[PDB]
Amino acid sequence: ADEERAETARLTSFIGAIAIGDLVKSTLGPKGMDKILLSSGRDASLMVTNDGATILKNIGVDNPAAKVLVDMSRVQDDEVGDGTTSVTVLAAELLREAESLIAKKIHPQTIIAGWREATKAAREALLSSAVDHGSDEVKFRQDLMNIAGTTLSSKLLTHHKDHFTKLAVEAVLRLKGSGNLEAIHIIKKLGGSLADSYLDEGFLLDKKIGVNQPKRIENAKILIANTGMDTDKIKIFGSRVRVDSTAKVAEIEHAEKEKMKEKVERILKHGINCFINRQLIYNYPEQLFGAAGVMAIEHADFAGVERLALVTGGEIASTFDHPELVKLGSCKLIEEVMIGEDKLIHFSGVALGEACTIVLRGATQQILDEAERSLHDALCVLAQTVKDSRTVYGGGCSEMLMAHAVTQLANRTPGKEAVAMESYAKALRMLPTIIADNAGYDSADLVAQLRAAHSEGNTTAGLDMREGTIGDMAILGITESFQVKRQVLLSAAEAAEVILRVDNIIKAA
Amino acid sequence: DRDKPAQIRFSNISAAKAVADAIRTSLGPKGMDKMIQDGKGDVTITNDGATILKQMQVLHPAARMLVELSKAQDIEAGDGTTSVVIIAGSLLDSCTKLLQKGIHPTIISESFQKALEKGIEILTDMSRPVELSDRETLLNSATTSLNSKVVSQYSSLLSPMSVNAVMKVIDPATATSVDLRDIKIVKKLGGTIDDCELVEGLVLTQKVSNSGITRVEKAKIGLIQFCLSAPKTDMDNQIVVSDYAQMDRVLREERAYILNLVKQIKKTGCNVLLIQKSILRDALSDLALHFLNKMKIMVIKDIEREDIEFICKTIGTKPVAHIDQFTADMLGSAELAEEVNLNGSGKLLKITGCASPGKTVTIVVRGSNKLVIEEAERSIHDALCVIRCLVKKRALIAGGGAPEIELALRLTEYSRTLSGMESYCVRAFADAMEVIPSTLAENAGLNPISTVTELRNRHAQGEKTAGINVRKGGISNILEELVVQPLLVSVSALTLATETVRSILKID
Amino acid sequence: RDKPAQIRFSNISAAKAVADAIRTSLGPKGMDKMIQDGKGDVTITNDGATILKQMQVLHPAARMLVELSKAQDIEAGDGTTSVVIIAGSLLDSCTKLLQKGIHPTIISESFQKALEKGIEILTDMSRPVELSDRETLLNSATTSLNSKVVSQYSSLLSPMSVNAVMKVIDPATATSVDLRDIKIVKKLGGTIDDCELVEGLVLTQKVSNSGITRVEKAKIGLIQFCLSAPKTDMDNQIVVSDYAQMDRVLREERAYILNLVKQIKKTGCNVLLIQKSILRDALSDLALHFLNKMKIMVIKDIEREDIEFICKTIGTKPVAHIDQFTADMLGSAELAEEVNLNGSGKLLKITGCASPGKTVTIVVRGSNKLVIEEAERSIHDALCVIRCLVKKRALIAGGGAPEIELALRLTEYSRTLSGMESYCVRAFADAMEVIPSTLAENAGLNPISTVTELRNRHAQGEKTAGINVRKGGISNILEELVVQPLLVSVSALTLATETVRSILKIDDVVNTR
Amino acid sequence: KSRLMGLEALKSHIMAAKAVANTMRTSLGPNGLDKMMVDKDGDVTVTNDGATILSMMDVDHQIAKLMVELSKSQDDEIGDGTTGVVVLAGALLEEAEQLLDRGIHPIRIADGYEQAARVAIEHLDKISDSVLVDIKDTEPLIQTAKTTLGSKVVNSCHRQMAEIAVNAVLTVADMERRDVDFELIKVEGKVGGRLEDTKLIKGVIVDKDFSHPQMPKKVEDAKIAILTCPFEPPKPKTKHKLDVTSVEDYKALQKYEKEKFEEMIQQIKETGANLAICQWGFDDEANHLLLQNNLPAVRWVGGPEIELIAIATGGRIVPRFSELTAEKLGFAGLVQEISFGTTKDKMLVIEQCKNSRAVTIFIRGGNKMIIEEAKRSLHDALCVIRNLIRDNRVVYGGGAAEISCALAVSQEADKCPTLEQYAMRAFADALEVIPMALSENSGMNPIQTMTEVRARQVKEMNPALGIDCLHKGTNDMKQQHVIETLIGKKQQISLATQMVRMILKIDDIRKPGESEE
């Protein structure tokens, strides 16, 4: 196994991971330019990305240091949502620094040293640019509407965001201080328009067994079950699948019917008007639920039967291991109703009040799953925005603010730490270059002016990639929540600092 | 880099003009055929945009964008497959330099996609409204386009049949897009051109009813996606006899399926039955289907699914894949349904009249032989297409690429009116319109170089009069020899250039 | 950039191999060099103490060492290899220390700190011995003369060296008995047996034939004056075309000058050292033999040696034309003696004169200059090592041996400094063990028996002693009669310290066009 | 056939060794830098602890192969210097090489290294304190078990791991000899918690068999029934389906299980716990019917486990249903059923005071690699006191002791002379290479910070204060709280000075032509 010493791994660390920070910063900003997605080894079919996380997920990279970023990318993208393309570049921004610093004789120990303290200096300046908006519900309304769709900006489909973010803020407006994304039932379902993407108050199922089970019911008891029917679960009502004798295989079906039929009983005898099964429902027990006033929905959504268990107050049957014994889902309203082109089974009267079904309606699924990809990262920031209602002034504003802050701190520090810390806030100054140069406008003008603006200090005028020029952050909607920034300010310098301690790399590959 | 992406997008910019150039000297019938060797290594002689790009092709992203272009033109229109590919490389010249001229490619695109908006604004302004409710003005710009274009012979017969289908399927005044979904292109084998018909109910390809009713009134349209044969293992029926002592015991329960579902057809009642093919459906018991026929339901056994699809949605015969789904209601109700050996030779089940979603008409392409049936296709269809363009964007316009050269003249000055860093953009944009008729004034012969010179000036002078006669290929009138663009044939190709280009300019 | 390192490394490289090819030293080692040159010229060279200077090497640091080769030879005249053998002993540590994370600056004072402490310990191993002592003169000469050319004529040269120094001795432990002072002159003929110490000033000139003064009563030479005569300094309108009138000019030219040389002998001059310049012809060959008619020792084109020593000793200046006679700026002379031993050689001996309390003029003789130079360079370096003992009164271990004593003990000061250069000292404190094992270098087969022992031979002898490098056998390195004053070794270290420290500042690429 | 001569072999042994040694010296201290491992599969892992990463490193070259084998015995007793041996074993290496290239025999200075190793040992043994106690060690163990965690996994002190790592030793330290061994306590990695979430257990623990969560989770007595025999009907890793001669015989089959449950519960009840540890995972449809008879059976757990948890109590496993015996059943001081993680089920926690032959610190983590290097932390904090148990002993420095250790060996060189003076030259400096090579991977001059304590060792002796592993501005090996068993440093010397000599073993470097392939 081959030992990579300092510069071998470290250059290999830069070339990939900084370029990994590049094609993603090529996507940084909505005017971060579209990157045609050229996949590695499979799927020649090409999307075109305004968000670099795709590339990271689409294109695999051989650089191990770059293999780290995609995960850190997914750290943001999953945990924090937005900040995904950004966490990758700021590290590369700090890596571009260590390009010199290493060859400039600075040991990566020191390179972490300043960035250890410097990370908070920006955090603290971004704690200073952290100011609570959303301290009022109307604020919170528009504070969501601020950073809700702001999450959707670079992300390829910012257009239906008009209808989407209104949906996205309403469901979280309904959360009312208690973030629940499981009480939001996420259904990406084709049909109708994309502006026909919808938010139900209640639960819902994209699964419809059909109209051969009762469609609408009031005061309905929903059985939440993995209970099988043709599947032959426990508690013999009549012969299940087995051979106990010559003719015992024949005693199966008719008594399996009775078993299916008393697996109506056990299921029905809950008193249900709806039986929602995450597993199969055979047609006779199905239709015998349809004859029992029970709506039996086959193989209903895993997450749905799970959220129906969460939002509606249901318990899973333990896979019929509670033949009569399982607590029901209880939703006073059953609606089999068409959102889009598809009849979907709506459930209201559910246990949770925040319980909602956001129905994302694809006019095409490429935008639909994209709506769902743009949906939750907002909801990620939103639940964050819920818990901490606040903003930070983006578009380079707080960047340059933090830049002028940490640098002037890198000016009052400047021991071994500033060697990193001057290298630190320059990245805070270098990302404002990225979006504006993505915007195709001189940063050296704007940045160095944004510098002056934030060398005067600023919460307001910041580089607006919408305008492509320096402009207000008043909470204009391009003012970012403190939610993602702190996470990126945490997550970004890490992978840099992470590779900073391991230049030594032993490779048996 | 953006430059490696540039060099990529230049390669995109380049290859997008590369194979699309075979389309450019192919513009119109005066545009020329290109013999095209194929991945199979076969010469293919094609003058048209949709065929050339989609027939022999390569792996480059531009080639991916090529096939999108006429196709996006097709779903919009089906008319202007070539022209939509002519506008790309036009802009691709307007595009490439602005990079090299120091303009950011989003600014280049947000120019051109906006330059589109302001630009194509005056197209409809230059344009003229025509009546989409009146059959003639429909048939006019339908056939006037067909007079401007190749298909005449059975069109002037079936272009009114087109509009006869169109007039039937036009509910509103803008006539929506006249979705050809409201129309049904169908083909009978025997018969001549004049046998081409328009039926509110749906004509069905062949039919099979053995003991059954050949013509049935107020006809419940049955759908059997189930079987008339008990489910198969080694046979069509459920009978497999390995023992007689068991066969008496097998006798008992095999008697139902042939009876029940068959009778269930007339238990729910059916005047008709749609049944997919004995290959499309496991087994169809004829011994059951005979009694099923003999119940005097109208059985079309082994019927194609895509007609069933058009039966399901357009005349409202709702899906029955199952007995749980088989009811009298999910049956369509055919005001008449008839097996028709008439209109030449061969059987066709004709639902004649129906309760239908939309306005459903089946236009059955027919001709003395198969190609003459195929001659009847674009005879109905091309007019339907130029109509569905004329209706989707209501106004008509004088065609022939004059509005290209016409508004190419103007938007430049209006680009120049914009100032900003995109004036040079939008002007380059505006210029690109000129090359489409250039190639046209090229391909039709002689001098394109002159043609657009005076025209764009004539378009500051006479405009709509002086233009490119596709026959003449020079300064002329598309009004004097009538060349009409139903706006959507133009309005289609407008954004499709800018869109993929905006993408491929934004593409890294 | 990379430019400084490589050539600086090459300064440490190209000069080291030269300095590494050096040590064959002290007697019978290696095989003779009959040297086809870089130009192909074939040349025989032995006893590399002289070959150092003789060696022709290019490259910046490599030619530096030949220029550094005289550094020991220029002031001292004993153990000329001592600086060149250690010229690579510093280049030993050079590579490592540049590669050790130690700056050329930190390596610069490293040489100093190693030089500073080195010459310090050498004083402890310098045994002070009397500056005027006949023995510490004779034996210093002897030990040298034993190593120098003549080991027999040493018994003649060593006291003559003593007697030459003890005449000019300015007894001190500081600078005295310079080389400008003692005048070492060579005379064809006689013998090294007849090499004569002469207290008085002896000028070595080309004297015309004989029948001239070996005797007393002479006014000294060093005259620049021409003899003005018709057809010399005087106008003659006699025109020369015909042979007879061309004959009339030389006769008045020749007949007149013989009165001038009488006026020159009238000055009391039996000797004239005539300027190598010419006022016209200065003194013509008419004038010169007329001078020889007056028994006046006369050399036209006299050497610069007898011009300055006659100024240094006899106190002599030119005198004017002898018609103008003289200012008597000619110094005091009495015996003008041309020794003819079998007639060989022309030697001007002034016995009694003005003298600056100094300048013994020792006449070095023999059957030939080769026999003469057997004594001359030997008596010189005998004078020199005596001069060195007059310079520094002491005798230390000879032949590079004490550096190995200085090796171990400087390794102790490697600890006492406790600095970044203490490591530098340490690397070089072990780089002075190299010479004795390396002096054995070049001769022969089955090598290694010499090496680590000569290292250990002092190491095993604690900080006291080891085998002699020039003598042999286990003893004190210091007291052998291989002995040199402390000057020679503290010279060598001081000399190589600087020029090799320049390498540390040698950087980039810069060349005068 | 390849034939190497003398240095040639050596020079061939020099190539990767120093390169491997080079990777060690930038790993030295928090100043140092971890060694990432990309596997033969390409698996990218940050690692350390040379024998560990040298086991991950594929050893082709010969001298590296002992570096896995030598450093093995290094990590066991000590826990540190495994990354530090190859430093000196690489540092002392070219010491001899250049001497061999100075013409010095392998016959000559190679003894001198060990001969200087003992005297450096002898010198080391004075430095700081050969003395600790079960109380004193704790603070060294604190500053060990703070930083041992606080180097590898986090940099922060995690106390619940810190002193529980040392007390786990201290729990079995006094079980034997006043000496634990490194197996005599165990570190069990599983992640249900965070890093700080851990279980100090005086016996082994497993996740209990749960055949359904709603069935009651119970624990009783002090004792456990460890079972090869049936606890309830056993199942031998083999399905048993439903075959009954009548529709009533299925419900008649239902009683057979439950009655044989309680019967063999009753047969386990009198013997040990009511709980199983059963070498047979039985039918989980039936197991939760016994979990409905409660008294939870621990089943579907390894056959080695019933062996493990038995012997960890000093007990046995009941081989046969007729062999049921309390001694053939395992034990505990307390068997308790405690939740593994916060949310998940309750693992059976067997805390064994009826014997502890392994006191298992069970550890949780946010992730493996952290709980790994938290485990890998614990192991060293466990290994360092495995020195302490034998002699309670420590020292402060690699830049305090060694520069001082060298300082004796330093002038001792010229006290040697002839053979080993060049050894104790090349020995002493090779010691000071480590503070050098650590000052190397520090932000400081490896010469100057070595010069730092050099002047300090020309001043202070046996220093508690030496250069910075913790990378501070002040260098105090006591107050950097770099703490290493003077056994370990001694053993390290013995182990680090070892390999270089060993490449000299016999005169045969002779290969058929394959010394590596």
UniProtKB/Swiss-Prot annotation, chain A:
<dbReference type="InterPro" id="IPR027409">
    <property type="entry name" value="GroEL-like_apical_dom_sf"/>
</dbReference>
<feature type="binding site">
    <location>
        <position position="86"/>
    </location>
    <ligand>
        <name>ADP</name>
    </ligand>
</feature>
<feature type="modified residue" description="N6-acetyllysine">
    <location>
        <position position="166"/>
    </location>
</feature>
<dbReference type="GO" id="GO:0050821">
    <property type="term" value="P:protein stabilization"/>
</dbReference>
<feature type="binding site">
    <location>
        <position position="480"/>
    </location>
    <ligand>
        <name>ADP</name>
    </ligand>
</feature>
<keyword id="KW-1017">Isopeptide bond</keyword>
<dbReference type="GO" id="GO:0006457">
    <property type="term" value="P:protein folding"/>
</dbReference>
<feature type="binding site">
    <location>
        <position position="485"/>
    </location>
    <ligand>
        <name>ATP</name>
    </ligand>
</feature>
<keyword id="KW-0007">Acetylation</keyword>
<feature type="modified residue" description="N6-acetyllysine">
    <location>
        <position position="139"/>
    </location>
</feature>
<dbReference type="GO" id="GO:0070062">
    <property type="term" value="C:extracellular exosome"/>
</dbReference>
<feature type="binding site">
    <location>
        <position position="395"/>
    </location>
    <ligand>
        <name>ADP</name>
    </ligand>
</feature>
<comment type="similarity">
    <text>Belongs to the TCP-1 chaperonin family.</text>
</comment>
<feature type="binding site">
    <location>
        <position position="85"/>
    </location>
    <ligand>
        <name>ATP</name>
    </ligand>
</feature>
<dbReference type="GO" id="GO:0031625">
    <property type="term" value="F:ubiquitin protein ligase binding"/>
</dbReference>
Swiss-Prot record, chain B:
<feature type="modified residue" description="Phosphoserine">
    <location>
        <position position="11"/>
    </location>
</feature>
<feature type="binding site">
    <location>
        <position position="80"/>
    </location>
    <ligand>
        <name>ATP</name>
    </ligand>
</feature>
<dbReference type="GO" id="GO:0070062">
    <property type="term" value="C:extracellular exosome"/>
</dbReference>
<keyword id="KW-0378">Hydrolase</keyword>
<keyword id="KW-0963">Cytoplasm</keyword>
<comment type="subunit">
    <text>Component of the chaperonin-containing T-complex (TRiC), a hexadecamer composed of two identical back-to-back stacked rings enclosing a protein folding chamber. Each ring is made up of eight different subunits: TCP1/CCT1, CCT2, CCT3, CCT4, CCT5, CCT6A/CCT6, CCT7, CCT8. Interacts with PACRG. Interacts with DNAAF4. Interacts with DLEC1.</text>
</comment>
<feature type="modified residue" description="Phosphoserine">
    <location>
        <position position="159"/>
    </location>
</feature>
<dbReference type="InterPro" id="IPR027413">
    <property type="entry name" value="GROEL-like_equatorial_sf"/>
</dbReference>
<keyword id="KW-0547">Nucleotide-binding</keyword>
<dbReference type="GO" id="GO:1904874">
    <property type="term" value="P:positive regulation of telomerase RNA localization to Cajal body"/>
</dbReference>
<dbReference type="GO" id="GO:0006457">
    <property type="term" value="P:protein folding"/>
</dbReference>
<dbReference type="GO" id="GO:0051082">
    <property type="term" value="F:unfolded protein binding"/>
</dbReference>
<dbReference type="GO" id="GO:0005829">
    <property type="term" value="C:cytosol"/>
</dbReference>
<keyword id="KW-0143">Chaperone</keyword>
<dbReference type="GO" id="GO:0016887">
    <property type="term" value="F:ATP hydrolysis activity"/>
</dbReference>
Curated annotation (Swiss-Prot), chain D:
<feature type="cross-link" description="Glycyl lysine isopeptide (Lys-Gly) (interchain with G-Cter in SUMO2)">
    <location>
        <position position="255"/>
    </location>
</feature>
<feature type="modified residue" description="Phosphoserine">
    <location>
        <position position="2"/>
    </location>
</feature>
<feature type="binding site">
    <location>
        <position position="83"/>
    </location>
    <ligand>
        <name>ADP</name>
    </ligand>
</feature>
<feature type="cross-link" description="Glycyl lysine isopeptide (Lys-Gly) (interchain with G-Cter in SUMO2)">
    <location>
        <position position="241"/>
    </location>
</feature>
<dbReference type="GO" id="GO:0051086">
    <property type="term" value="P:chaperone mediated protein folding independent of cofactor"/>
</dbReference>
<dbReference type="GO" id="GO:0044297">
    <property type="term" value="C:cell body"/>
</dbReference>
<feature type="modified residue" description="Phosphoserine">
    <location>
        <position position="322"/>
    </location>
</feature>
<feature type="binding site">
    <location>
        <position position="81"/>
    </location>
    <ligand>
        <name>ADP</name>
    </ligand>
</feature>
<feature type="binding site">
    <location>
        <position position="468"/>
    </location>
    <ligand>
        <name>ADP</name>
    </ligand>
</feature>
<feature type="cross-link" description="Glycyl lysine isopeptide (Lys-Gly) (interchain with G-Cter in SUMO2)">
    <location>
        <position position="190"/>
    </location>
</feature>
<keyword id="KW-0206">Cytoskeleton</keyword>
<keyword id="KW-0378">Hydrolase</keyword>
<feature type="modified residue" description="Phosphoserine">
    <location>
        <position position="515"/>
    </location>
</feature>
<comment type="function">
    <text>Component of the chaperonin-containing T-complex (TRiC), a molecular chaperone complex that assists the folding of actin, tubulin and other proteins upon ATP hydrolysis. The TRiC complex mediates the folding of WRAP53/TCAB1, thereby regulating telomere maintenance. As part of the TRiC complex may play a role in the assembly of BBSome, a complex involved in ciliogenesis regulating transports vesicles to the cilia.</text>
</comment>
<dbReference type="GO" id="GO:0005874">
    <property type="term" value="C:microtubule"/>
</dbReference>
